[PDB]
């Protein structure tokens, strides 16, 4: 791979304070060298400095954890990708043919809850952000809904396939999903930065505020650091940090979570758009220089993320800016990846 880019990487840092990020930071792990930077503030009242080392929460990128438990126990022979999910969770779900690759893949045509919570961002937020669900309750919610899409027949990205996600693996193994992360990814990859507290508000440690923007242009931000999440779950509620965000995609892609099958199948594509894929709770970008990383973001109240790996995992790129609702923000801070794959142009 091209040397990453610093300077790059410090001008898209900078971009996104100018765009409103209160924070924003990157760290690369190079093939065992590191790059780190940071710009902002974690804390925007008091003005501590945000730094690569702070938690802070990763939002969907939950769902490649959650995946890689699921595939595991495909490896363990408790779960077929292709078999019907209400063959394990009766009555669940309005379409009996909806299959587990389908829910993993986002082509199972469930209606996204967050559809009819967050279509106005702070009331939403204000509205769940102390609240405690089910897994149920949020497939309930779903279920007001029709589906979308005919069974595996095109892709919709829908937390409430993760939520399915989650109830599997409950359901399956007969412990929480908190216990399953723990003990098949946190605990041998040592990520002692990474953690799932739900229904617990607090961030364990030295951590990043998040602010959610406002929908109205000029708003005054909003400190949406302390949450449940449980609105998302499985789908969602994992706090960690960008070394092990790093740590933890260079495993997956380097061939240490699942066996070769399993990870095969996890690659397997389907197409979001002309520079993206989707395969199995893993992310697929295409970068301007003829390279593709692999790995996902999050967007959760307060923290837009990125966590990406090349084919290898040799070469690992986590970023986070401390806002979200904010599409600048979020466009640039997708320029890190090519800054730190692609290089100086
Ligand atoms: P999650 O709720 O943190 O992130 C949401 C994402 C994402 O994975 O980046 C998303 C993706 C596509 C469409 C809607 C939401």
Redesign the pocket.
Known sequence: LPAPDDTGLQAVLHTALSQGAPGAMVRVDDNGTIHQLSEGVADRATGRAITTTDRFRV?????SFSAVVLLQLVDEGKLDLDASVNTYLPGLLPDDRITVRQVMSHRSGLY?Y?NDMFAQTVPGFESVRNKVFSYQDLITLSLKHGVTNAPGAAYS?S?TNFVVAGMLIEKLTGHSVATEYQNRIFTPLNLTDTFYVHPDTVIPGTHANGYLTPDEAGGALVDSTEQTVSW?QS??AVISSTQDLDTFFSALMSGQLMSAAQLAQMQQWTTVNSTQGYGLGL?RRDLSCGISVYG?????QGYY?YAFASKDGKRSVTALANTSNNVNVLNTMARTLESAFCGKP
Request: proline share 0%.
């Open positions: 939002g969907s990128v939950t769902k996204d967050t990205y937390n998302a789908a969602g992310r996902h973001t999050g967007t959760v993320t």
